[PDB]
């Protein structure tokens, strides 16, 4: 109970989910938590604090350096500023980070322990000190499909995603919900009138969607009632940075050669935002190395970790269990719609849904803390 | 101007879009429209009728048989009732139908004239009398990607769809909008308070979504804030009827051997409902028969018909131009996100958006009428 663990970014959305999980799992009984803040350093720490009842300065190298471990959800700009300074000052502790900044560095491991505990443990023995959560899309895909990769069955995969607002941030979630209000408000009286004409309702909704009152400052365009087929930076070659992460991070998590080199697994596709709060869904075309029976595939997938489940490939079950409505706020990672595609027995469809803030953000970080504790 | 054209199902949603389009394009000037009714036979026809100002009876074989052409948006149950009776009574006019019922009959053509005008014209010469619109998903996909098929360049395609409520019907659209009210209404006060906590808002939205007050009688489950990864009947083999239509109807529209036979092109994938009103979008993995340069692909797609629009594969253009917000209520069929995938030069991505009620429903029907008129 004497590991000194600094928490940075704990006030933000991802950090708040992390605090809740750490409390739920009893993690604070196992450590001495030290709370950092970008503002209000010297104020009172949160309830979780034990001996360190005062907030420390998030950009103070001297206070950060006293920690054995730092868990940060503060983001990439923070990492890019503070991390080099802290290491340059001689800090030799463990850095656990949600941000993308350090993911592809040779002295960092991308962490998803139900999938790559072996990669993590080997790196710890090799003296690695940087442990970085992967992109939410990749983490969620591998929590669902990791069994097939573990059995070396995947030739390649395309993923067409259906991504939630939470990946863009809290203000984006708020804008989505405000947009829902704009669209419903434009037709509230008409919806209450059974005799109203659908084409009038449709006209009114479109006029509201594309009008001045629709709040679009966060997304740039409507999300409610629509979709956005580009996420993150434009790499200038027809690929988004979100899409690029798929292949780069999948191969690194699994300890394979870099994307495009022999032995790597091609993972590619299109990343598209839809009007969901906090669950990402993905529709997969998977080429396997051989024609494996479906029953065997179901077992390989279901047995891979404690959170995946396979949803029977049937209408009612798929409608009720394979959706954001069912999965939001839970640690479950269902996969379903598993069948062979018309091209042949080596071609497999899949559809998976996972909570972006849990396995896609906070959960791997606290699990890495538990690995460092041997708990 | 003397072709007698019966209109059935003209008061429903698809029929109303059809009526608006026929008015816009001057179609009624070229025909004698005869309006049919299931519930008000003998009543007043719409004011854009000409000499036939009284509604005829939609199930009167005698009234129907007087038509040279019948265009029906009334649905499959109606077709299955009257069509076989009309034919058995010796009616030899043209039947133009939005419904799926007759699509796969050997004496019917699936119509999408900017893609298969040749198939349609050959069928007319050979005496075919049944011209049936295709499934919205396939029609919209082919409006965008048909150039590659027409050049015989496609080995296979998977399509992961993002489908609108309009495909399910007007009451489903209304439910989607009511659901948006339920979700926003649960948090409107919190949204208006800049200091409110996002995890409180999130909790409240989920409780509303899964609570008894969320209206779900039409979809069975939430759509707003969610998605539904199954559309239409369960075929009992892990495929929905909506997904089955992809391969079946793509091959038939194009005049290829039946899906699964030598020379057919496999089209398959997963059909997923999202919270949009009336545009379907689709994300495609396409295997081509050879490694075609991207500029050549773009030219083949753009030159295929007058409605496809290639959207440059850039962030700003994709966000602005490749969405339901842009496309809804228009005849434009954008396709973009076109690049080679990591597997190799023969693998192509694409993303397309199209209005379900226009090219996916009403538009091919009025265009077929124009073909019959020359």
Other beta carbons within 10 angstroms of residue B71's beta carbon come to 28
Are B225 and A325 in contact (CB < 8 Å)?
Answer: yes
B363 and B225 within one domain: no
Residue A339's contacts (CB-CB under 8 Å, 6 or more residues apart) are A294, A313, A348, A349, B237, B238, B239
Chain A residue nearest residue B207, CA to CA: A325
Are A191 and B178 in contact (CB < 8 Å)?
Answer: yes
Other beta carbons within 10 angstroms of residue B124's beta carbon come to 14
**Contact by Cβ (8 Å): B241, A316:** no
Q: Is A192 exposed, middle or buried (0-12, 13-18, 19+ CB in 10 A)?
A: exposed
Task: Work out whether strand A347-355 and strand A279-288 pair parallel, antiparallel, or are unpaired.
Answer: antiparallel
| B-interface mutation test, from A218, A222, A227, A235, most B Cβ less than 10 A away | A227
Other beta carbons within 10 angstroms of residue A122's beta carbon come to 13
Instruction: Give the count of domains, chain A.
Output: 2
B121 and B144 within one domain: no
Instruction: Write phi, then psi, for A357 (nearest 5 degrees).
Output: -85, -20
Cα of A191 to nearest chain B Cα, Å? 7
Distances (CA, A) of B270 to A85, A337, A340, B232: 49, 8, 12, 12
Chain B residue nearest residue A12, CA to CA: B198
Nearest to B160 by CA among A270, A355, A317: A270
Q: What is the CA radius of gyration of chain A?
A: 22
**How many angstroms separate the CA atoms of B82 and B87, rounded?**
9
B194 and B68 within one domain: no
**How many angstroms separate the CA atoms of B40 and A171, rounded?**
53
Other beta carbons within 10 angstroms of residue B255's beta carbon come to 14
- Is A280 catalytic? The answer is yes
**Contact by Cβ (8 Å): B333, B354:** yes
B260 and B205 within one domain: yes
Other beta carbons within 10 angstroms of residue B98's beta carbon come to 26
**Contact by Cβ (8 Å): A362, A18:** yes
Chain-centroid distance of CA B296 in Å reads 28
Task: Work out whether strand A56-57 and strand A279-288 pair parallel, antiparallel, or are unpaired.
Answer: unpaired
Q: Residues B183-199, buried b or exposed e (16+ Cβ, 10 A)?
A: bbbbbeebbeeeeeebb
Q: How many CB pairs under 8 A join A and B?
A: 256
Nearest to A277 among B170, B202, B313 (CB): B202
**How many angstroms separate the CA atoms of B154 and A16, rounded?**
49
Are B13 and A342 in contact (CB < 8 Å)?
Answer: no
B87 and B163 within one domain: no
Nearest to B325 among A162, A199, A209 (CB): A209
Distances (CA, A) of B320 to A217, A257, B114, B276: 14, 37, 26, 16
**How many angstroms separate the CA atoms of A328 and B355, rounded?**
30
Chain B residue nearest residue A259, CA to CA: B342
Solved using? X-ray
A117 and A45 within one domain: yes
CATH number, residue B67: 3.40.50.720
Are A181 and B180 in contact (CB < 8 Å)?
Answer: yes
Q: Is A42 exposed, middle or buried (0-12, 13-18, 19+ CB in 10 A)?
A: exposed
B159 and B31 within one domain: no
Q: What is the CA radius of gyration of chain B?
A: 22
- The H-or-E segment that residue A78 falls in is helix A76-88
B97 and B84 within one domain: yes
**How many angstroms separate the CA atoms of A280 and B226, rounded?**
10
A114 and A207 within one domain: no
Cα of B109 to nearest chain A Cα, Å? 24
Nearest to A180 among B173, B183, B199 (CB): B183
Q: Tell me which of A67, A136, A271, A279 is the catalytic residue.
A: A136
Nearest to A227 among B199, B274, B320 (CB): B274
Distances (CA, A) of A341 to A153, B18, B227, B334: 16, 36, 22, 27
CATH number, residue A314: 3.30.360.10
Would you state the structure tokens that stand for residue A160, as one six-digit string? 């067409």
A130 and A220 within one domain: no
- Is B279 catalytic? The answer is no
Q: Is B324 exposed, middle or buried (0-12, 13-18, 19+ CB in 10 A)?
A: buried
B299 and B310 within one domain: yes
DSSP string over A332-367: -EEEEEEEE-TT-TTEEEEEEEEETTIIIIIHHHHH
**How many angstroms separate the CA atoms of B362 and B18, rounded?**
5
Instruction: Name the residue with tokens 């030290």.
Output: A34
**Resolution of the coordinates in A?**
1.5
Nearest to B135 by CA among B228, B247, B43, B276: B247
Q: Which domain holds residue A351?
A: 136-356
A131 and A185 within one domain: no
The 8-class DSSP code of residue A227 comes to -
Report whether B12 belongs to an annotated binding site: yes
Distances (CA, A) of B273 to A37, B189, B242, B277: 42, 30, 11, 11
**How many angstroms separate the CA atoms of A212 and A374, rounded?**
56
**Contact by Cβ (8 Å): A253, B353:** no
Task: Work out whether strand B130-133 and strand B94-97 pair parallel, antiparallel, or are unpaired.
Answer: parallel
**Alpha-helical segments (H) within chain B:** 13-24, 61-65, 76-88, 113-125, 136-150, 170-185, 188-191, 198-210, 241-254, 294-302, 315-321, 324-327, 363-373
């Amino acid at each position: 109970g004497s590991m000194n663990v600094g928490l940075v970014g704990w006030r933000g959305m991802v950090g708040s989910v992390l605090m809740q999980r750490m409390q739920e799992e009893g993690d604070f009984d196992l450590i001495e938590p030290v709370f950092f803040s970008t503002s209000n350093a010297g104020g009172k720490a949160p309830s979780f604090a034990k001996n360190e009842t005062t907030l420390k300065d998030a950009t103070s190298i001297d206070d950060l350096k006293k920690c054995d471990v730092i868990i940060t959800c503060q983001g990439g700009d923070y990492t890019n500023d503070v991390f080099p300074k802290l290491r340059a000052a001689g800090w030799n502790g463990y850095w656990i980070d949600a941000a993308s900044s350090l993911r592809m560095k040779d002295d960092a491991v991308i962490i998803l322990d139900p999938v790559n505990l072996n990669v993590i443990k080997d790196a710890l023995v090799n003296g690695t000190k940087n442990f970085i959560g992967g992109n939410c899309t990749v983490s969620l895909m591998l929590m669902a499909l990791g069994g097939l990769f573990r059995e070396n069955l995947v030739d390649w995969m395309t993923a067409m995603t259906y991504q939630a607002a939470s990946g863009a941030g809290a203000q984006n979630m708020r804008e989505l919900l405000a947009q829902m209000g704009t669209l419903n408000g434009a037709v509230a009286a008409q919806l209450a009138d059974p005799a109203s004409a659908i084409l009038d309702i449709d006209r009114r909704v479109l006029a509201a969607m594309n009008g001045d009152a629709m709040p679009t400052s966060q997304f740039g365009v409507p999300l409610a009632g629509s979709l956005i087929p580009w996420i993150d930076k434009d790499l200038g070659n027809g690929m988004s940075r979100e899409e690029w992460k798929g292949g780069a991070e999948t191969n690194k998590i699994l300890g394979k050669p870099a994307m495009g080199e022999p032995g790597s697994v091609p993972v590619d596709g299109l990343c598209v935002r839809i009007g969901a709060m906090r669950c990402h869904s993905q529709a997969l075309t998977i080429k396997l190395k051989k024609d494996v029976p479906l029953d065997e595939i179901n077992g390989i997938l279901a047995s891979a970790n404690d959170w995946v489940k396979v949803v029977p490939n049937e209408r009612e079950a798929s409608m009720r269990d394979l959706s954001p409505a069912k999965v939001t706020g839970t640690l479950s990672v269902p996969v379903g719609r598993l069948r062979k595609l018309a091209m042949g027995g080596e071609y497999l469809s899949a559809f998976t849904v996972g909570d972006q803030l849990l396995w896609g953000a906070a959960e791997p970080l606290r699990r890495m803390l538990r690995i460092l504790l041997d708990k």
